[PDB]
């Protein structure tokens, strides 16, 4: 999919694509934030020193 | 035919799909080269020493 | 259109997201948006279980495989992937897959024009799993309260949690759940046998109808539940069994922290005597 | 030792494996019984019957029906009625689109089975589902509200008519259908109706005013066949997908 | 033949009439003798006080003979003889009731499927009380006739034979009980969902398939890839319920007779999980 | 499947095929990232020394 | 099946056979990769010394 | 309900009311007698000294 | 009042009587469950 | 109206119900005063000492 | 309307319900004043000291 | 049933009789082989001394 | 979605979208508040010193 | 069944009989191989000394 491939929406439903993409992006963002929270250096709410080893 | 597409439609769709897949594979190859430069991922006879 | 009568039923509709992109079948299975999410979560969870199996240093068999939850010291936080994080991620994926299975069943029911009794009943099993792995751990303040994901190790979790109260048989909710589970098997045996006896009367006998079905139980126990009442009764019995299991596990630790036999001092030393 | 055959094998393991064999045989038998309806399978693209082994399809069993007749399962009968729905390209799994009115045609959730064209009977041979206006031995329990006279509201909040009678199962003493005179008479399946005794209304959210005007009707006003029952129930069930939308 | 409004809401309202017959009367006589024995031993155990009986009824029981009596055919009364009599009379009443159910199925022209489903439960009950004590030669291995006491017997039976969780037939019986609940919830919900299509009239759907049976089959085919018929799901449920008590009897037969420690049996067969040694230096102080 | 085999879309439905392919690729990427996260040398968020022995 | 046995596809559906083959091949590849990862000499991500005995 | 409210029975069925009242009174009397029997001082059959402390 | 033109007096009275009896039993049990108010056990007030 | 009672019947029933409720509440108030005289049930700042 | 109750019968019912609710709230306010006079329930900085 | 009573098959169905008889014979043979294996003197695979006491 | 894309609601139902968005926002707000409460520096009800190490 | 009793196939369906016989033979072969594996002297994969005593 590119800036010029506008005819993708003649095949793929815009509604399903938008609702599936939004769900996937929210799930991915939550997963990555939790993975960052699960490690010593990147847990910003915990505030460990950056040099963790 | 079976899918209801015309060979003209299938040809254009395959052009777009082929370009997208080739770009995805090129990005994956670049990411793999970057990951190898970060840390090589095939051990020697002695391991990660 | 696989069964001899399936073609006329395979139409568009039933989607919970309002779209035709995922409306299709792969073999006998119906694929939805929630079918795709079910497969996503399922393959993630199964692959992570296999990863935890191959990374186990003790070389366990399929029975001895165990992905254990984090330590109770990690609280409701995040554990290392090899120290409970894998269990946490598999729990999240399992909850997502079960909810997606229920929603896909809702979609199939909407397509077939039937009631949503099946997704609703499966929601009780999903609620039991959630109460075991998410709700009770948060009530107790640690994800380490969930059971390990292993065929045989979750039995050890059950055993030790039961012996944490010195006699789990004396839990009143446990008693109610066991009563309802045994009654569900009794009722299922009675119902299956009655329908099989009506449909297979034997040699020289015609297929019996509702009169014979009601007469058999009025002649045996003294009451007939009917043909619609038996299925309501069975659904109610199974749902009550799972509900009382949830209650008994939510009162063990969050509520009762001592031996379960001494809870009956409310009856032994009831203010009457 | 007592229950040992060797240093590894023992009696419990062998009994467990014997039960494994028995359980797998029982599951095989059960799966054979599962294939008494709808098999052999057919392809989704041309309707070609798929070949199933005689070890997976059981031999036909004969049901001697209570009122006469013999039903066999499997029966070599296949539902080949023309479905009034189409799809673009015969791709396996592609869902169908109704050409006209899916409710009248019986497409999808409105589809019905060609059952017996005779009314259902009781043990003594008298019609099982009859309107209450014909039988004097059957009445309505005074503890429950009487549906008769209640207004009938569709899913569009429109009063489409009033309940004129109730059709009762004489074999189970249960109300099966509601005879509704449209403000010309239709049967509403009771599971598809919600009663409100304070406002004296019956809500059928699966129908619109347009769908009520096309509900199939029995040939007789005191007699309904199994096929007519099946068609009416399928119509109201398909209304959940095709009416208010 | 009275009516019941409350029972007429969940199902039918008619309670009766009940046909007892010869085997029914015999079963009632035997069972009443058994119940009288059990209840009078319970009431005598609180020194006949009904206040204490009300207080302690869950804790009261009729207790089996001790291990010092072995399989003595009739031990002294107050040392397990009352239990042996109550077990004999209960077994006779249960067997006569099974014959009654078989006969009721036969006289109605119906199949004897409920009778042979009851036979599985009777087999489990007999293994629990008579057959296994005979092989082990001790009445003491049988459950007491009491509310909390047979739970104590359950727990002590699991403890005595090394964590009955590791009994493969206990695992199978638990799988079959969970499957009984699963299948019966599935079937109740499925029939209730197609009740708008006449699905509760299942036997009429068996000899004449309607859209209710077709949609019930297709829901499960589209959900899990396979389905049953309107009659086959009842065979599924019947067999699942029968296997509960069949595997229960099989796993109780094997406890103490061929397997004495189930956890060690699982250790031999690579079933018991091994956990990291958190307590490194703990050994048996009596070794 | 090569650059010149454009007629595969006359047999495979583009919509279903791409939905399945997107799901498979995303899940495979998640699995391979989790595998790197589960090993000492390749967990970039934990940041252990490269020489893990 | 050989190079010259082109008439398999008059007996086997090409599309369903391709889906089944793709599923089998990915499952087998995952099985073998996990088997390699579960052994100390062939776990390339753990990087144990090659001579493991 | 007092002496002058004779019209209770125009709203309450006398037979059902009498049966329910008899059952309630018997159960209440049994409850209070068991309450007396369950306490040392008012158990007339056990006959403890009144001064029970 | 017109309360009884909307609520059935019989059912309201039978439900209220049941509620009041249950409440009285519960409060009496609450009093018997404390040493200061157990008038049958007869413990000292203080 | 909703219940098959005439407004006069409802007024008479309300009169009797109000009388009965007032009597019940008066007896309960006297019972609570007697119970307070027996042993007060609201503790002071020091407790039951 | 959607209830079927007349707009005047609803007015009478709301009048009676309003009086009942106002009496209930007055009794609750009196009970809360009495409970505060028994033991105040908002601690100071020092707490229950 | 003897060598001359050929009219048994006018009473018992041959096909089902042989199927049931084969099942019974196989089950009995397995049971007796396992009974021999369950005893020290007759377990030919364990090979204990024939003198067993 | 922007200030000028008013025809989104010709594609998405305004009411189901509103209720789904409300549910999502409430759940997200609850999750973020609980994450703040689960960490020492941001649990405003426990009142730990801001400098937590 | 002997070399000359060719009319058994007028009684037993050749297809189902072959399938059932194959299933029985495979199950029996697996059972005998596993019983050989379950004894020290005949487990060819463990390679115990033949004199197991
Ligand atoms: C973001 C604005 C445009 C867009 C602009 C472009 C441009 C320009 C290009 C692509 C290209 C690609 N796009 Mg794009 N693309 C869009 C939305 C999508 C969506 C989607 C459903 O949202 C998908 C699956 C894709 C998929 C893809 C890939 C298959 C393909 C190259 C793979 C890759 O680089 O990373 C792997 C893919 C992923 C990890 C998932 C996709 C993630 C993002 C959206 C990929 C876009 C990267 C693109 C270069 C960023 C340009 C946007 C800038 C902010 C201006 N695009 C929208 C419509 N896209 C390239 C191509 O086909 O040439 C060979 C290319 O040059
Ligand atoms: C990427 C752009 C083109 C494409 C371009 C080519 C070219 C050119 C060739 C192939 C060949 C093959 N392709 Mg290809 N291929 C595409 C998309 C696919 C898809 C898919 C559903 O997306 C699949 C399953 C395949 C599968 C395959 C293999 C079955 C086949 C040989 C196996 C192999 O060499 O590597 C093993 C397979 C894997 C590790 C997994 C397969 C997935 C990837 C996409 C394989 C393609 C990699 C290809 C060799 C690299 C060329 C693209 C460059 C980036 C420019 N292709 C798209 C349409 N493909 C080769 C062939 O026919 O053999 C003689 C070949 O020469
Ligand atoms: C690879 C390109 C060709 C192909 C070319 C050949 C040639 C040439 C030969 C075979 C032969 C065989 N092929 Mg072939 N075969 C193909 C695809 C298949 C597929 C499939 C569903 O994809 C299957 C199951 C098979 C199976 C088989 C075996 C049943 C058979 C002999 C078994 C064997 O040698 O090893 C056991 C098989 C397996 C463990 C699984 C099979 C997997 C692969 C695909 C088998 C390839 C074997 C063959 C030597 C490939 C090398 C070809 C070189 C490029 C020249 N082929 C494709 C179409 N195949 C041989 C034969 O028929 O004997 C007379 C033979 O000489
Ligand atoms: C002799 C028994 C007479 C009777 C004669 C009277 C008289 C006189 C009075 C009442 C009053 C009342 N009666 Mg009366 N009452 C009767 C039967 C009942 C029954 C019943 C279903 O049997 C019930 C529920 C009641 C209930 C009540 C109360 C709601 C009400 C005041 C509460 C109370 O005094 O103590 C609480 C109630 C209970 C704990 C349960 C009821 C117990 C008994 C049955 C009530 C009798 C109490 C009354 C003082 C007895 C005095 C009779 C003497 C001859 C004077 N009565 C019969 C018909 N009842 C009083 C009243 O209306 O006040 C304005 C009042 O002055
Ligand atoms: C073996 C080949 C013949 C056969 C030839 C004979 C002859 C000859 C005699 C019998 C006799 C008997 N047969 Mg015969 N019998 C056959 C098959 C059967 C089958 C069967 C379902 O296959 C059954 C249940 C029987 C049953 C019986 C017994 C009821 C009866 C003697 C009891 C006995 O010996 O105790 C043990 C039995 C069992 C534990 C069960 C049966 C096992 C076998 C099959 C019984 C055969 C025993 C027989 C003596 C062997 C003779 C064969 C020699 C080569 C001559 N037969 C076939 C058709 N059978 C005897 C008789 O009728 O007495 C007057 C007798 O003289
Ligand atoms: C808030 C007032 C307007 C609105 C005004 C604008 C303006 C102006 C812009 C956008 C832009 C975007 N909007 Mg908007 N947008 C609205 C409602 C939405 C909703 C929704 C369902 O409620 C969603 C999912 C979005 C999503 C988006 C993104 C897809 C897109 C760029 C992503 C981004 O910048 O951050 C990532 C987004 C998220 C993580 C979630 C989205 C959160 C909010 C609602 C997005 C608006 C943020 C915007 C940048 C701030 C400007 C609004 C000010 C309050 C005036 N908008 C409402 C109707 N929106 C930008 C764009 O089109 O790119 C070129 C842009 O310039
Ligand atoms: C509430 C009443 C009973 C109930 C009801 C019920 N269950 C149901 C249904 C109903 C009505 C369905 O419609 C649905 C179904 O489709 O059944 C065929 C389902 C179902 N009941 C199932 C099983 C099941 N039900 C159980 C119990 C019960 N189900 C209750 C007793 C149990 C028990 C007691 O153990 C089990 C195992 C499934 C067959 C099915 C739901 C299938 C499903 O969710 O599929 C999507 C998920 C996957 C394909 C796999 C996901 C895997 C995860 C990603 C990783 C693994 C996580 C897991 C926690 C590991 C566990 C390890 C050890 C603990 C073993
Ligand atoms: C569907 C419902 C969902 C909601 C469920 C939760 C609802 C809860 C409402 C609870 C209302 C409580 C009302 C006041 C309770 C008073 C106490 C009481 O009811 O009496 C209790 C026993 O009651 C008893 O079982 C009562 C039963 C006795 C007879 C049993 C037969 C005992 O009393 P306590 O003082 O605890 O003595 C114990 C110790 O302190 C002293 O040894
Ligand atoms: C005072 O009491 C009155 C009069 C009011 C009556 C009331 C009675 C009451 C209240 C009774 C209550 C009973 C209860 C609560 C019983 C509960 C029992 C439970 C829970 C039992 C659980 C398990 C028991 C089992 C499995 C027992 C099995 C026993 C068997 C199968 C024994 C068989 C024995 C045989 C066949 C003996 C044969 C005789 C021989 C052959 C030995 O003679 C030589
Ligand atoms: C959804 C609510 C989540 C609440 C999480 C509370 C627990 C997180 C903080 C305590 C556990 C981590 C402590 C620090 C460990 C090292 C750094 C990751
Ligand atoms: C029902 C889900 C959880 C509801 C909120 C629970 C709040 C209490 C959590 C306490 C955690 C810290 C104490 C235990 C360690
Ligand atoms: C190798 C083990 C094979 C086990 C096969 C079990 C088959 C069980 C079949 C049970 C049902 C039989 C038919 C009953 C019909 C109704 C009769 C009244
Ligand atoms: C022509 C297609 C016929 C159907 C093929 C697919 C069948 C899929 C069956 C899925 C359910 C299998 C459940 C097995 C559970 C075993 C215990 C884990
Ligand atoms: Fe049923
Ligand atoms: Mg031995």
Minimum distance, in Å, between the CA of residue I21 and any CA atom of chain J: 13
Is the CB of G47 inside 8 Å of chain C's CB atoms? Answer: no
Contact C75, C145 (CB under 8 A): no
- DSSP class per residue in D154-208: ETTS-EEEEEEEEEEETTTTEEEEEEEEE--EEEEEGGG-EEETTTTEEEETT--
Minimum distance, in Å, between the CA of residue D4 and any CA atom of chain L: 6
Residues whose CB falls within 8 Å of the CB of residue C81, separated by 6 or more in sequence, listed in order? A38, C89, F34, F37, F38, F43
CB contact under 8 A, N52 and L46: yes
Residue with tokens 């549906």: D147
User: Three-state SS for D62?
Assistant: strand
Which DSSP helix (H) or strand (E) runs through E2? strand E2-3
- Identify which of D185, D174, D193 has the alpha carbon closest to the alpha carbon of residue D233: D193
Q: Are strands D185-189 and E61-62 parallel, antiparallel or unpaired?
A: unpaired
A22: closest chain C residue by CA:
C17
What is the D13 CA–ligand 8 centroid distance (Å)? 51
Residue with tokens 């299948």: E183
Residues E124-128: contacts with CB under 8 Å, at least 24 apart: E124/E245, E124/E246, E124/E248, E124/E249, E124/E252, E125/E91, E125/E94, E126/E91, E126/E249, E127/E248, E127/E249, E127/E252, E127/E253, E128/E249, E128/E252
Which DSSP helix (H) or strand (E) runs through F16? helix F14-37
Q: How far apart are the first and last CA of chain F?
A: 41
- Identify which of B18, F1, K46, A9 has the alpha carbon closest to the alpha carbon of residue C21: A9
Is the CB of C273 inside 8 Å of chain H's CB atoms? Answer: yes
Minimum distance, in Å, between the CA of residue F34 and any CA atom of chain D: 34
**CB E224 near ligand 7, within 6 Å:** yes
Residues whose CB falls within 8 Å of the CB of residue A27, separated by 6 or more in sequence, listed in order? none
Rounded-to-integer distance, Cα N43 and Cα B22, Å: 54
Instruction: Produce one character per residue of E157-170: b if its CB has 16 or more CB atoms within 10 Å, e if not.
Output: bbeebbbbbbbbbb
Nearest residue CA, atom 56 of ligand 1? A1
Rounded-to-integer distance, Cα E261 and Cα C1, Å: 53
Q: Are strands D129-131 and D159-169 parallel, antiparallel or unpaired?
A: antiparallel
F44 CB neighbour count, 10 Å cutoff: 14
What is the C69 CA–ligand 11 centroid distance (Å)? 17
Q: Which two tokens stand for residue B49?
A: 């020493």
Q: Considering every ligand atom, which ligand is closest to the CA of E141?
A: 9
Which of G44, G48, G51 is nearest residue B41 as measured by Cβ atoms?
Answer: G44
- Identify which of K2, N38, G51, E262 has the alpha carbon closest to the alpha carbon of residue B44: G51
Minimum-distance ligand 4 atom for the alpha carbon of J24: 32
Residues paired with D165 in a beta bridge: D179
Cα separations in angstroms, C162 against A20, C249, D14, E159, M2: 43, 10, 31, 13, 57
Is H11 labelled a binding residue?
no
**CB C201 near ligand 12, within 6 Å:** no
- Chain H residues 1-53 with CB within 8 Å of chain E: 34, 37-38
Residues making up the binding site of D for Mg(2+): 4
Residues paired with C52 in a beta bridge: none
Do chain G and chain F touch with ≥3 beta carbon pairs under 8 Å?
yes
Rounded-to-integer distance, Cα E188 and Cα D186, Å: 29
Q: Which two tokens stand for residue C162?
A: 């039961």
Q: Which two tokens stand for residue E26?
A: 């015999």
Rounded-to-integer distance, Cα C90 and Cα C266, Å: 41
Cα separations in angstroms, C104 against C38, E224, F18: 9, 11, 20
Rounded-to-integer distance, Cα D172 and Cα C224, Å: 10
Nearest residue CA, atom 10 of ligand 8? I26
Minimum-distance ligand 5 atom for the alpha carbon of L21: 21
Q: State the alpha helices, DSSP H only, in E68-131.
A: 81-107, 113-126
Rounded-to-integer distance, Cα H15 and Cα H22, Å: 11
Chains touching B by CB (3 or more pairs below 8 Å): A, D, F, G
Minimum distance, in Å, between the CA of residue F14 and any CA atom of chain C: 11
**CB D26 near ligand 12, within 6 Å:** yes
Q: Which residues of F touch C51 (CB under 8 A)?
A: 31, 34-35, 38
Contact E80, E63 (CB under 8 A): yes
What is the N24 CA–ligand 5 centroid distance (Å)? 27
- DSSP class per residue in D89-145: S--TTPPBEESS-HHHHT-GGG------SSB-B-TTSSBSEEETTT-SS----TTS-
Chains touching F by CB (3 or more pairs below 8 Å): A, B, C, D, G
Q: Write the DSSP symbol of residue C151.
A: T
**Residue C86: cis peptide before it, omega within 30 degrees of 0:** no
Q: Which residues of E touch H38 (CB under 8 A)?
A: 51
Dihedral, CA atoms, C72, C75, C81, C83, nearest 10 degrees? -20
Q: Are strands D61-64 and D70-73 parallel, antiparallel or unpaired?
A: antiparallel
Which of D233, D237, D241 to mutate against chain E (most E CBs within 10 Å)? Answer: D233
**CB E87 near ligand 9, within 6 Å:** yes
E140 CB neighbour count, 10 Å cutoff: 18
Residue with tokens 């804790």: E59
Residue with tokens 């393959």: C43
- DSSP class per residue in H1-53: --TT-GGGGGTS-HHHHHHHHHHHHHHHHHHHHHHHHTSTTT-TTTT--S---
| Listed resolution, Å | 2.7
Burial class of residue D69 (count of CB atoms within 10 Å of its CB; 0-12, 13-18, 19+): middle
CB contact under 8 A, F6 and B11: yes
Minimum distance, in Å, between the CA of residue A37 and any CA atom of chain C: 7
Which DSSP helix (H) or strand (E) runs through D61? strand D61-64
- Identify which of D151, D218, D214 has the alpha carbon closest to the alpha carbon of residue D180: D151
Which DSSP helix (H) or strand (E) runs through E14? strand E14-15
Contact C183, C164 (CB under 8 A): no
Q: Are strands D194-196 and D61-64 parallel, antiparallel or unpaired?
A: unpaired
Q: Considering every ligand atom, which ligand is closest to the CA of M6?
A: 6
> Alpha-carbon torsion A28, A33, A36, A38, what sign?
negative
**Under an 8 Å CB criterion, which residues of G touch F?**
14-15, 18, 26, 37, 45-47
Cα separations in angstroms, D189 against D152, D194, E165: 13, 10, 49
Pocket of ligand 11 (CB under 6 A): C 75, 135, 138-139, 141-142
Angle at D58 between CA D55 and CA D61, to 5 degrees: 165
Rounded-to-integer distance, Cα D28 and Cα D80, Å: 29
Q: Which two tokens stand for residue D241?
A: 């997908």
Angle at E148 between CA E144 and CA E151, to 5 degrees: 70
Technique used: cryo-EM
What are the backbone angles phi and psi of residue D186, rounded to the nearest 5°? -135, 160
What is the A38 CA–ligand 10 centroid distance (Å)? 8
Residues paired with C256 in a beta bridge: C252
Chains touching A by CB (3 or more pairs below 8 Å): B, C, F, M
Which of F15, F45, F49 is nearest residue A11 as measured by Cβ atoms?
Answer: F15
What is the K23 CA–ligand 4 centroid distance (Å)? 26
Minimum-distance ligand 6 atom for the alpha carbon of M17: 21
Minimum-distance ligand 7 atom for the alpha carbon of C150: 63
Minimum distance, in Å, between the CA of residue M21 and any CA atom of chain C: 13
Nearest residue CA, atom 48 of ligand 5? L2
Rounded-to-integer distance, Cα C76 and Cα C142, Å: 5
Q: Which two tokens stand for residue C171?
A: 């839990």
What are the backbone angles phi and psi of residue N12, rounded to the nearest 5°? -110, 130
Q: Write the DSSP symbol of residue C62.
A: T
């Amino acid at each position: 999919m590119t800036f010029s491939t506008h005819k993708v929406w003649l095949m793929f439903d815009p509604r399903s694509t938008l609702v599936a993409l939004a769900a996937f992006l929210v799930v991915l963002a939550l997963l990555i934030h939790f993975l960052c929270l699960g490690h010593d250096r990147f847990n910003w709410l915990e505030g460990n020193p950056a040099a963790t080893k | 035919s079976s899918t209801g597409l015309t060979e003209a439609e299938a040809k254009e769709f395959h052009a777009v799909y082929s370009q997208s897949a080739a770009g995805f594979l090129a990005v994956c190859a670049v990411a793999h080269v970057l990951a190898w430069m970060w840390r090589p991922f095939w051990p020697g006879a002695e391991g990660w020493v | 259109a696989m069964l001899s009568f399936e073609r006329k039923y395979r139409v568009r509709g039933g989607s919970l997201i309002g779209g035709d992109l995922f409306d299709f079948w792969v073999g006998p299975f119906y694929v939805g948006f929630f079918g795709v999410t079910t497969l996503f979560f399922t393959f993630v969870g199964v692959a992570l279980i296999a990863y935890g199996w191959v990374m186990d240093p003790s070389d366990p068999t399929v029975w001895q495989l165990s992905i254990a939850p984090p330590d109770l010291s990690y609280g409701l936080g995040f554990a290392p992937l090899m120290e409970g994080g894998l269990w946490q991620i598999i729990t999240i994926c399992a909850v997502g897959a079960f909810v997606s299975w229920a929603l896909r069943e809702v979609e199939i029911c909407r397509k077939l024009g039937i009631g949503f009794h099946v997704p609703f009943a499966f929601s009780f099993a999903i609620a039991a799993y959630v109460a075991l792995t998410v709700v009770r751990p948060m009530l107790l303040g640690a994800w380490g309260h969930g059971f390990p994901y292993g065929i045989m190790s979750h039995l050890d979790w059950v055993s030790n949690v039961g012996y944490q109260f010195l006699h789990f048989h004396y839990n009143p909710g446990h008693m109610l759940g066991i009563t309802f589970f045994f009654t569900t098997a009794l009722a299922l045996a009675m119902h299956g046998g009655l329908i099989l006896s009506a449909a297979n009367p034997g040699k020289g006998e015609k297929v019996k109808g509702p009169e014979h079905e009601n007469t058999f139980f009025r002649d045996t126990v003294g009451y007939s539940i009917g043909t619609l009442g038996i299925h309501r009764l069975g659904l109610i019995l199974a749902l009550s069994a799972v509900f009382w299991s949830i209650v008994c596990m939510l009162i063990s630790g969050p509520v009762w922290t001592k031996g379960w036999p001494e809870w009956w001092n409310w009856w032994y030393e009831l203010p009457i005597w | 030792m007592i229950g040992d055959f060797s240093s590894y094998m023992d009696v419990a393991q062998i009994v467990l494996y014997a039960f494994w064999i028995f359980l797998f045989g029982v599951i095989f038998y059960l799966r054979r019984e599962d294939r008494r309806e709808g098999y052999p399978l057919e392809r989704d693209t041309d309707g070609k019957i798929m070949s199933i082994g005689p070890w997976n399809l059981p031999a036909p069993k004969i049901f001697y029906k209570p009122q006469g007749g013999t039903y066999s399962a499997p029966n070599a009968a296949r539902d080949t009625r023309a479905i009034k729905a189409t799809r673009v390209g015969n791709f396996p799994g592609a869902p169908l689109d109704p050409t006209g009115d899916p409710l009248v045609d019986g497409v999808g959730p409105a589809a019905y089975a060609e059952r017996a064209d005779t009314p259902d009977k009781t043990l003594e041979g008298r019609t099982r589902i009859v309107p209450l206006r014909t039988d004097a031995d059957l009445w309505l329990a005074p503890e429950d509200p009487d549906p008769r006279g209640m207004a009938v509201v569709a899913g569009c909040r429109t009063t489409v008519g009033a309940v004129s009678d109730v059709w009762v199962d004489r074999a189970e003493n249960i109300i099966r259908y509601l005879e509704v005179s449209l403000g010309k008479t239709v049967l509403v399946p009771m599971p598809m109706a919600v009663f409100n005794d304070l406002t004296r209304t019956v809500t059928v959210k699966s129908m619109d005013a347009k769908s009520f005007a096309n509900v199939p009707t029995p040939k007789s006003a005191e007699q309904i066949t199994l096929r007519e029952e099946d068609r009416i129930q399928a119509y109201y069930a398909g209304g959940t997908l095709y009416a208010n939308k | 033949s009275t009516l019941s409004y409350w029972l007429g809401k969940i199902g039918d309202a008619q309670i009766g009439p009940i046909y007892l017959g010869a085997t029914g009367i015999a079963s009632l006589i035997f069972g009443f003798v058994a119940i009288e024995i059990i209840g009078l031993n319970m009431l005598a155990s609180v020194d006949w006080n009904p206040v204490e009986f009300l207080r302690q009824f869950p804790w009261l029981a009729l207790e089996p003979p001790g291990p010092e009596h072995g399989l003595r055919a009739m031990p002294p009364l107050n040392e397990g003889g009352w239990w042996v009599m109550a077990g004999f009379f209960l077994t006779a009443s249960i067997l006569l009731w099974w014959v009654r159910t078989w006969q009721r199925a036969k006289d109605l022209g119906m199949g004897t499927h409920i009778a042979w489903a009851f036979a599985s439960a009777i087999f489990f009950y007999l293994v629990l009380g008579f057959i296994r004590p005979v092989m082990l030669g001790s009445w003491s291995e049988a459950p007491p006739f009491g509310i909390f006491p047979h739970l104590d017997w359950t727990a002590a039976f699991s403890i005595r034979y090394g964590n009955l969780y590791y009994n493969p037939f206990h695992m199978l019986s638990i799988a079959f009980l969970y499957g009984s609940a699963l299948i019966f919830a599935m079937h109740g919900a499925t029939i209730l969902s197609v009740s708008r299509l006449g699905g509760d009239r299942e036997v009429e759907q068996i000899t004449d398939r309607g859209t209710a049976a077709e949609r019930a089959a297709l829901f499960w085919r589209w959900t899990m890839g396979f389905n049953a018929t309107m009659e086959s799901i009842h065979r599924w449920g019947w067999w699942c319920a029968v296997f509960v008590t069949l595997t229960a009897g099989l796993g109780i037969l094997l406890s103490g007779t061929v397997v004495d420690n189930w956890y060690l049996w699982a250790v031999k067969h690579g079933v018991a999980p091994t956990y990291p040694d958190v307590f490194p230096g703990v050994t048996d102080p009596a070794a």
